[PDB]
Amino acid sequence: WEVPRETLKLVERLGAGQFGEVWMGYYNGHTKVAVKSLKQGSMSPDAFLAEANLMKQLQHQRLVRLYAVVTQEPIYIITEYMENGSLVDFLKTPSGIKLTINKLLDMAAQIAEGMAFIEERNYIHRNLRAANILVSDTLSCKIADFGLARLIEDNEYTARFPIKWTAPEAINYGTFTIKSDVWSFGILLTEIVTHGRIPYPGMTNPEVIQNLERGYRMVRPDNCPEELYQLMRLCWKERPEDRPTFDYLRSVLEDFF
Numbered sequence: 001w002e003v004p005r006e007t008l009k010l011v012e013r014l015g016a017g018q019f020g021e022v023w024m025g026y027y028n029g030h031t032k033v034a035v036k037s038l039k040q041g042s043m044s045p046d047a048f049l050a051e052a053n054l055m056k057q058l059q060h061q062r063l064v065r066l067y068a069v070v071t072q073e074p075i076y077i078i079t080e081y082m083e084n085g086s087l088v089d090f091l092k093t094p095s096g097i098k099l100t101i102n103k104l105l106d107m108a109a110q111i112a113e114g115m116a117f118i119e120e121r122n123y124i125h126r127n128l129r130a131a132n133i134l135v136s137d138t139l140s141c142k143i144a145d146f147g148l149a150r151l152i153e154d155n156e157y158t159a160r161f162p163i164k165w166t167a168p169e170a171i172n173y174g175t176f177t178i179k180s181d182v183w184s185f186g187i188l189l190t191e192i193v194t195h196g197r198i199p200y201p202g203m204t205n206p207e208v209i210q211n212l213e214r215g216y217r218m219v220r221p222d223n224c225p226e227e228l229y230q231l232m233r234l235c236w237k238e239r240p241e242d243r244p245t246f247d248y249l250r251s252v253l254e255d256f257f
């Protein structure tokens with residue numbers, strides 16, 4: 001997986017944040033890639049490279065594909081390039097805003113498909129939200145930053161804490177399982193149908209927490225199909241055992257229309 005830095009030309013910076021940068025570049029002259037580079041001192045090379053190791057372990061059409069790593073300073077992780085960047089941002093563009101419910105649900109289904117694979121392999125995401133989904137030129141969706149031992153923020157590698165996607169038992173006890181990812185997925189569905197609106201709009205993180213102690217659930221978003229809302233409400237059942245599998249979520253979303 002290790003390559004000489006010479007095999008890579010970084011062309012254009014796509015973002016910079018607290019822990020490093022992401023660039024568009026070319027690999028072996030012809031392959032368009034994205035390159036995540038570590039800012040020295042942010043974390044150890046091993047902590048950074050764990051993300052690459054997880055992409056080695058889990059390969060799937062709905063998961064972001066690893067091409068290579070460079071393990072001398074600055075450390076690089078090299079992946080496939082996704083023309084439409086992060087789903088959370090794409091949804092806010094002219095093209096994104098004009099997507100039909102049909103196409104949005106196809107995208108939700110692809111995300112449930114990738115999560116169904118993670119579930120079947122007995123991994124967890126822990127960081128599931130529209131920010132961590134990448135979108136290709138043909139609107140195919142790929143899950144990034146899965147299986148990490150840590151919770152990530154959106155400003156680490158671009159200019160911009162994810163309490164709003166976190167299930168109650170994870171807030172209260174630090175219990176993270178595939179069922180807390182199912183919770184996060186229900187929140188992600190609200191992002192998809194509102195063309196990228198922040199969850200619990202006009203609540204701060206502490207207010208969300210106070211509301212969840214009282215059993216609060218977001219209302220049906222404007223224009224959201226009622227059946228899709230009922231799917232959301234299943235993802236948000238208080239007890240993790242009452243939440244559906246991703247296998248089921250995928251099957252419902254795939255055949256939705």
Ligand SMILES: CN1CCN(c2cccc(-c3cnn4c3N=CC(c3ccc(O)cc3)[C@@H]4N)c2)CC1
Pocket residue numbers: 014015022034035036051064077078079080081082083084085086134144145
């Ligand atoms: C016209 N478009 C051009 C591309 N733009 C854009 C903006 C921000 C990120 C991306 C973009 C495209 N691909 N990727 C991106 N961001 C992070 C990636 C990544 C890299 C390494 C890693 O370990 C995990 C994830 C990745 N593959 C693309 C969006 C607008």
